[PDB]
Amino acid sequence: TIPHLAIDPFSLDFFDDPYPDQQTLRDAGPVVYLDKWNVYGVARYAEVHAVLNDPTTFCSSRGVGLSDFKKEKPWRPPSLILEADPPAHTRPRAVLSKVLSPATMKTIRDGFAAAADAKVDELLQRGCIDAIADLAEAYPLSVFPDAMGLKQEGREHLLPYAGLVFNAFGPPNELRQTAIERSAPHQAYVNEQCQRPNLAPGGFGACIHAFTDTGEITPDEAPLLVRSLLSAGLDTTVNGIGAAVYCLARFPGELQRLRSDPTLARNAFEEAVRFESPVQTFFRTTTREVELGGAVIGEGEKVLMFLGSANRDPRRWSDPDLYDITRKTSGHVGFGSGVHMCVGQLVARLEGEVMLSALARKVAAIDIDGPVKRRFNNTLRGLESLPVKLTPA
Numbered sequence: 550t551i552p553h554l555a556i557d558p559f560s561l562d563f564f565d566d567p568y569p570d571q572q573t574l575r576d577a578g579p580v581v582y583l584d585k586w587n588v589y590g591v592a593r594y595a596e597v598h599a600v601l602n603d604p605t606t607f608c609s610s611r612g613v614g615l616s617d618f619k620k621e622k623p624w625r626p627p628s629l630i631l632e633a634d635p636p637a638h639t640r641p642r643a644v645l646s647k648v649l650s651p652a653t654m655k656t657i658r659d660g661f662a663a664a665a666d667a668k669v670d671e672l673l674q675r676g677c678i679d680a681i682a683d684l685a686e687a688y689p690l691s692v693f694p695d696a697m698g699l700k701q702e703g704r705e706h707l708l709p710y711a712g713l714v715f716n717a718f719g720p721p722n723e724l725r726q727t728a729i730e731r732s733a734p735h736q737a738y739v740n741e742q743c744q745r746p747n748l749a750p751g752g753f754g755a756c757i758h759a760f761t762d763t764g765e766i767t768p769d770e771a772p773l774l775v776r777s778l779l780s781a782g783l784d785t786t787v788n789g790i791g792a793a794v795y796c797l798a799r800f801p802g803e804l805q806r807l808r809s810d811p812t813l814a815r816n817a818f819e820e821a822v823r824f825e826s827p828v829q830t831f832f833r834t835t836t837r838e839v840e841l842g843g844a845v846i847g848e849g850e851k852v853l854m855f856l857g858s859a860n861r862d863p864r865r866w867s868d869p870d871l872y873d874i875t876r877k878t879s880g881h882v883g884f885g886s887g888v889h890m891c892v893g894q895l896v897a898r899l900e901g902e903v904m905l906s907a908l909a910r911k912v913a914a915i916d917i918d919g920p921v922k923r924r925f926n927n928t929l930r931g932l933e934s935l936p937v938k939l940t941p942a
């Protein structure tokens with residue numbers, strides 16, 4: 550028998566402090582039923598990992614938000630990668646893998662690192678800054694749109710579009726309905742930038758279009774694949790870098806360890822991804838009756854995976870509520886797991902690494918010096934404002 554809970558994981562109260570409710574979800578059983586939204590939930594590491602790694606049973610082509618594409622129209626044409634199952638998923642995924650490949654990181658690393666150092670130097674001249682607007686947002690905005698090959702005009706639509714995408718995975722609450730109400734201009738801008746003539750040579754977008762002659766994707770698939778990078782590629786890194794800075798601000802002992810060995814920068818960022826889990830949740834839809842954690846789930850049911858809870862499950866992690874930059878982080882699910890595991894993770898890690906390297910080399914202290922304000926989104930966890938004073942090294 551499955552426990553029924555009234556917790557709303559998409560309520561502002563939950564977003565404001567999810568950790569007690571996440572423990573309640575884990576401790577109630579391996580599988581729960583959320584009466585508020587008529588979905589199954591899994592919050593322990595073991596079940597989240599199992600669901601992610603059985604894409605045949607727990608599919609993505611019926612949507613990875615609450616909405617079931619077999620019942621309702623998607624709010625935008627489905628993603629060819631996120632909202633596809635194998636085998637249709639496989640070739641688009643291979644293209645994005647090569648576009649965002651280990652070999653590709655070599656071409657952009659020097660520029661990304663220089664921009665990170667420059668940003669930290671600029672911020673140190675001001676001393677008192679907002680680590681969200683002035684750092685977590687400003688740094689990705691200074692590198693990623695250019696790496697995509699976007700023109701300058703209209704970039705102000707990118708963060709609003711991403712906020713809309715991530716709110717739209719949620720249930721039809723006020724956050725989602727308001728986002729969709731305001732979406733038209735952001736949708737129009739993003740769709741237009743996905744066309745081949747609008748993407749500058751050598752950038753990620755042009756490279757996607759260049760793959761349309763190998764037989765992996767056709768020309769009419771390239772715009773939606775560019776759309777995937779313009780959906781997932783910016784706001785995630787904003788909240789990842791914001792999480793890392795928030796962690797270093799709250800845990801000065803870890804900033805001190807990072808300063809003493811800047812080569813810990815990449816793992817410090819990975820640990821921030823585990824600790825905050827910027828992408829909190831995704832859904833799957835069952836394609837058959839299935840037994841999961843001793844429970845029987847029928848066909849066509851939505852299953853909500855709590856990635857952030859899995860990343861704090863004491864059944865899997867020692868001292869899960871501690872930020873530890875030398876933790877063995879391998880196996881966290883902050884980037885997912887299995888066939889859909891974040892195809893952009895090398896870009897995310899590159900940005901996080903070079904930013905934390907710049908802080909490690911240039912900053913002696915990060916002190917919160919103003920009211921912290923949280924940003925509410927149905928899928929993303931992060932801050933609206935993080936006033937800090939940076940002391941130079």
Ligand code: HEM
Binds near residue numbers: 786789896
């Ligand atoms: C800290 C930053 C990031 C986090 C926490 C994150 C998180 C995730 C997660 C959890 C998934 C799995 C979705 C699922 O299983 O349904 C995913 C997939 C994906 N991510 Fe990331 N992401 C980040 C950065 C990026 C970046 C920078 C890009 C592109 C430049 C990107 C592009 C994608 C794409 C295209 C997919 C779909 C892959 C597929 O379905 O095969 N992400 N991401």
Ligand SMILES: O=C(O)c1ccc(CCl)cc1
Binds near residue numbers: 630631776777781828
């Ligand atoms: O294909 C997309 O549009 C897409 C992919 C991944 C994510 C989660 Cl980072 C969001 C949107």
Ligand SMILES: [Cl-]
Binds near residue numbers: 736739
């Ligand atoms: Cl769109």
